Design a protein around this ligand. Structure first.
Ligand SMILES: [Mg+2]
Length: 46
RNA sequence: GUUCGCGAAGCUUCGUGGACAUUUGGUCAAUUUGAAACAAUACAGAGAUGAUCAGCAGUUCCCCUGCAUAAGGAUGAACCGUUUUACAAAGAGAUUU
């Protein structure tokens, strides 16, 4: 509620109050890139 | 043929005038060439979305099954692509008269 009132996120607000591998990456990125770019599927490609 | 009359031969038989009854059927003609479809082989192959799947519609000079204004057909079929002008105004530079 406090966070909402602020317009801030919650965890950060709370913190403030308190105060006072590579291969996988490569592969996933490749996949992701393919996905985001390609406006395709079964019917579009076919 | 039925018969109701006339005229000849022996009620029986020929020859006649009438009356009765009167125009069917085909948009077609019997095997390839006036248009049935499935099936089969081969080849691919399943709406969004990353994937899997439901259902509903929509457009059409596409239909099918269905008694159907039910319902169902690959989301039933094809739609997913191509896509450059009622086109003017302002500024700068260049060649021709
Ligand atoms: Mg279906």
């Amino acid at each position: 509620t406090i966070a909402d009132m602020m317009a801030r996120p919650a965890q950060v607000c709370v913190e403030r109050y308190n105060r006072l591998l590579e291969d996988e990456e490569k592969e996933m990125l490749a996949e992701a890139r393919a996905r985001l770019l390609n406006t395709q599927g079964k019917k579009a490609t076919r």
